[PDB]
Design a protein around this ligand. Sequence first.
Ligand SMILES: Cc1ncc(C[n+]2c([C@H](O)CCC(=O)O)sc(CCOP(=O)(O)OP(=O)(O)O)c2C)c(N)n1
Ligand SMILES: Cc1ncc(C[n+]2c([C@H](O)CCC(=O)O)sc(CCOP(=O)(O)OP(=O)(O)O)c2C)c(N)n1
Ligand SMILES: [Mn+2]
Ligand SMILES: [Mn+2]
Lengths: 556, 556
Amino acid sequence: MSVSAFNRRWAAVILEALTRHGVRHICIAPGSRSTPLTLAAAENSAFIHHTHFDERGLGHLALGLAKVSKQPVAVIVTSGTAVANLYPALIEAGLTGEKLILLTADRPPELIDCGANQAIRQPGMFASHPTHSISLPRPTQDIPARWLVSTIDHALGTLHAGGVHINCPFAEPLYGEMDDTGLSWQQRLGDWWQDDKPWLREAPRLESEKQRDWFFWRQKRGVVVAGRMSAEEGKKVALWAQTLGWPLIGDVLSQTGQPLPCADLWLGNAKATSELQQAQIVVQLGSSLTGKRLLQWQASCEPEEYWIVDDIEGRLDPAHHRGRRLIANIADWLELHPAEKRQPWCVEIPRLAEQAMQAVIARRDAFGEAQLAHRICDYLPEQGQLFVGNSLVVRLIDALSQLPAGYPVYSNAGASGIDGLLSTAAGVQRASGKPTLAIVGDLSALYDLNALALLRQVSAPLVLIVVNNNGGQIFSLLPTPQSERERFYLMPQNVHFEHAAAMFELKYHRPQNWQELETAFADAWRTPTTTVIEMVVNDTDGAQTLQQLLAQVSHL
Amino acid sequence: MSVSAFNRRWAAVILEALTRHGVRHICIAPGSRSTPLTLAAAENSAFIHHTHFDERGLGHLALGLAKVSKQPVAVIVTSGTAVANLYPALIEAGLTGEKLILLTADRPPELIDCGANQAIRQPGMFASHPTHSISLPRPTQDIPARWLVSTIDHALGTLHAGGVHINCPFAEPLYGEMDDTGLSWQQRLGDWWQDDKPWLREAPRLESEKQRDWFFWRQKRGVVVAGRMSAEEGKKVALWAQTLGWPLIGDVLSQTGQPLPCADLWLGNAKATSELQQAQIVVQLGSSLTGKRLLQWQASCEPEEYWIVDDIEGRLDPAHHRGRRLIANIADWLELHPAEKRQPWCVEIPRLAEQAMQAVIARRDAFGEAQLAHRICDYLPEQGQLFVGNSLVVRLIDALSQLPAGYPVYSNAGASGIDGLLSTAAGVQRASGKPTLAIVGDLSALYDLNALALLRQVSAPLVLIVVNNNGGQIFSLLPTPQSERERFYLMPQNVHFEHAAAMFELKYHRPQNWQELETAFADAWRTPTTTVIEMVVNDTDGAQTLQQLLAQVSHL
Ligand SMILES: Cc1ncc(C[n+]2c([C@H](O)CCC(=O)O)sc(CCOP(=O)(O)OP(=O)(O)O)c2C)c(N)n1
Ligand SMILES: Cc1ncc(C[n+]2c([C@H](O)CCC(=O)O)sc(CCOP(=O)(O)OP(=O)(O)O)c2C)c(N)n1
Ligand SMILES: [Mn+2]
Ligand SMILES: [Mn+2]
C-alpha cells in the first residue's frame, strides 16, 4: 500500500533495535531522503536528540558523546556529500574505539548511476574504516522484520570498538499520513517490541588470556609507560607502578598524576637514557603517546620484551619490538597481573625529573602559551574535565605541566586531526554534564568555526581557550625550511575571535596578563554557558621556549 | 644516501609531470608529511599556488578553479583526516566532471596499522569515486623515474573527466639540505625535463559517432531540454532549437536565454503537458535538471525516443527512457547534427509561458527571496558571472527568472551539497578573474563559514548575497510533517552575518528595501573585494510564494 508508511515502519525497526544495545544519544542533520530515519528517531522516546547543520561537525559531536559516555552513539544524515562529511570522525573512531553508528539515507538502487539529483554510490564509500558495514536492501515486506533486526543485532552485538556504517535506501514517496502498511509485518516480532533485549543476542568478548609468567617478569627491572586510558585507570596504574618500584612515564592523556613529570625534557638527558637501558621489560598501558622524546625513546629502547596493554585491537608499537600485544580492559588487566612491593631500581631519573620541573617553574612568569600550558593545572574546573586540542597545546601540556591523578582528560589523538575539535568538545561536555575546559589553537578554531553554534548549548560552563599565535606554530618547532615556512606551512590567517563569539552570542575575553586571565576564568565558571577566552601570544615564543628547555635539561 | 633529498626528487617528478597535462593551479593545505610534495610544488614556477587551512574547503576551492578553467587542478594535503576532508569535492567532481588531481601524502607502509600518529589506511579510501586511483610505492631509486612519470601520464592522459587519487607515501627524514641524492636517477629522463610534452602520450578520445538517421528525426515533433552546459553552448542550443521550431525548455544552468521561461510553473498546467504528449522525440543537451515540474514531466513523457547529449559519461536519464545516450562536446555535437529550418509546432505552450511570467511579474514588489530570484537578471554584473547556491535559491531563480543567453552561470548541482559553496565560489572567481555574483542560503553560509577567509582575496568584485530565512526553508516547500519540521528539518540557527564579515574584514550590508539593495550593489562593484549582503526575509514567504504561483498558473 503506502510506500511512505512502510519506509517509516522499516526505519522504526532499525531505530528500536539500536535502543537494545545501549544507544541513547542520536545526532541528526537535516535532509529529505533521511525522513524515515529521522521521523522514526523523533518518535522514539529512548533517545536524546542532538542536531547540527554541518555533517562533519555532527560526526565529531557524536564522537565526543561516545568518547565520554563509552556507549554507541547513532548518527542520521541524508544522501550525498552529507554522508562523505562523516569520514573524519569515523576514521578517528576506528583508531580510538568510539562506537559510532552511522545511519546514512540513500536513494534506492533504481536511482543510482543515472544522473539523479543528490544520488551517489554509498555502499562501501568508507572503505576499510568502519568496523562493520551493512548495506541494507531496498525496503520490502518480502524480507521479514526478523532479518532486519537480526542484521542490526549482529553488527551491534559483535562490535568490540569503532564505527558501523549502515546504508539505508528509501524510495519516494517519503511523505504522507501513516496508515497500517507494514503493521502486521512489524507484529511478526511479537512482544520483542515490549522487551529490553536484542532479538538476536550475539555478544562474543575479545580478550587476551592472563600472562602466566607475569610473576617471573615482575621481578625484573621494568619501566611502566602510561598512554591514553580512563581517569580511574590512571590512578590504578600509578599505584601499581609505585608498588612495583618501576619508574612511571605518564602521558598527558594518562591521568596518572605524572610522578616523573616533564618526561619530554628529561628523556633528552643522557643520564636518563643510560639508566633506562637497564630495563629488561617495558609494560606500556594505553597508547597514542604524545611526546617526541618519549616516542624516540620507545623506538630506541631494547628490552628483552615490550608489552602493550590496551582495549583497542591490533599492533600499537610503531617500533615493532619483540614482545606482546595484550587486548584487555586496563583495570581488569591490572587485577590479573598484580604488583608486589619491591624496592625501586631507579636512582637518577627521579632527581632529573624534579630538576626538569624546577627549570620550567623558573620560566613560569612570561605571558605565553608555554607558560599557560605549564600552569594549566591552576585553571582546571573543580569536578570537571579537560579537552586538549592537537598540535602545540597537547605537546606543551605534556612536556611542561603535571596534571592531577584521576582528573579526566579527553582528546582526538588517534589521527590527531585539527578538523573537529570544537564540535568534539561540545559532545564531551554534553555527555558528562561536567564543567569543561577546552584548549585549541587558532587554525584549529578556524577549521571548526561553525561548531560555535553547538557551544551555544552546554549543560555546564565550558571555557574554550583559543591560543592565537597566528598560524600553525608547530611548523616553527619542526625544522621546516625558512623561505617557504610562512606561506606554505604556518599559514597565518591574521584574525581574532571576538566577532566569532559575538556572532553566536558567546561571552568573550582577550586577557592581556595573568590577572586578567584569572578574572576571566572566575567570570566564566559562573553560568552553564560557553565562554571564549582568546590568548594572543607572540608567534614563535612557545616553540622556542620548548626548545630552550629541552636543551637546558639535556645538560643537567 | 639522503632520504629527505630523494623524497623531494621523487615528488619533483610527480609535479613536473602534471605540468605537461595543463595543470596550472595547485591548492595546498599545511602539513609535515606533505613536505616533499609541497616543497616540490613551491619550487616549480609553472604553478599558481593557493593555500587554505580547511581541507574540505581546499577541495572545493580546487573544484571551483577546475569548474571555470576546464583544466585539471592539483591538490596537496598531508596524511590523516586531512585526506578524508577532500571527499565531498571529489564526489561532486565525479558527477560533473572537474578534473581534480589529489596528491595525498601518506606514511610509509611500515608505519600503517601499528598505532603510529596521524597514520591511517589511505589507498582506496575514496572507493569508486575517483576516475583513477594510483597507490604509489614507497620511494626508491630501484624503481626508475620513467615508471613514475609514465604512471602519472597514463592517469592524466586517459582522464575523460573526474578526479584522480594519487596516494604518495614518504618516509622520514623529511627535512634536510638538498644534496645530489637522486639527481642521476632524475637525469635518466634526459631532455624530457626541458620538453613541454608528457613522457608517455596516451590520450584516446571518447566520443559517440554521428547519428546517421538525424535527418529523419529532425523532421519530427521534437522538444529540446537544455541542462547544464557552457555559456557558449547555451547560445548555440538556443539558435538550434529555434531553427528546428522545437520548444526549448531551458534550465537556470543552461544559459539559453530561456525563451519559454517559468517552466517550473507552466509545466504544472495540464494544457502544456497535453501539447507535449505530441512530442515524438526529446533531445536533451546537458543534465542535472533543476526544477521539480521538469523532472516530473521528464519522468512522465513517452516520446518514441529520448536522447541525452553531454560530455560526461554514463546514464543521465533517471526515468530510463528508450533512446540514446550520446557522449560528446555539445557544441561539436550540434555541428555534427545541424538544424533544418522548420515550422514551429507548439502553439499552446508559448501562450502559457508568457502568462506564467506575467503572473510572476505581478508579484515582483515584495522584498522577499522569491522576488530577489525573479529580479536577479536585473542585477547581474556586466561581463561577470553568477554562482548559484543550492536549495531554494537555484529552484526560485529557475522557476521565476529569465536569465540572459550566454551569461555564465556556475553551481555545484551534481550532488547538490550545501557544504562547499563559499569556497567553490572563491575558486570560480579566481579562475576567470571576472566580477562575480554569488547567492547562497543561511545554512549554506554557516556550513562553509570559514571560507570567508578565502574571499579576502578576489581579483575582481565578488558580491555574496546570503539569503537569511532562518533555516533550511526548502523543508517548508516540501510536505514535511508540521510537528517535527522546525527541530528536525528547518533547524533555524537564529544568527546574522554581520560579525562574520567583520571577522574577515569584509564590507557588509543588511538592506531593508530594494533601494538599499541597489545602493549596496553600486558600492560593491567599485572594488576588487568581496562584499557580504545579507537579505533577511520572513522564513516561509519564498516557499509559499512559489506554491501560490504554481497553483495560479496551473489553473490558467
Ligand atoms: C584535518 C588536519 N589537517 C592538517 C593537519 C596537519 N597539521 C598538524 C599535524 O600535527 C602536522 C603533522 C603532519 O602533517 O605530519 S598541526 C597543524 C596546525 C594547527 O595549527 P594551530 O594554530 O591550531 O595550532 P599550533 O600549531 O599549536 O599553532 C596542522 C595543519 C592536521 N593535523 N589535521
Ligand atoms: C552537505 C549537505 N547536507 C545536507 C543536505 C540536505 N539539504 C538539502 C537537499 O536539497 C535536501 C534533499 C534531500 O535531502 O534529499 S537543502 C538543505 C538546507 C539548505 O539551507 P539553506 O538555508 O542554505 O537554504 P534554503 O533551504 O533555501 O533556506 C539541506 C540541509 C545537502 N544538500 N547537502
Ligand atoms: Mn596556532
Ligand atoms: Mn535558509
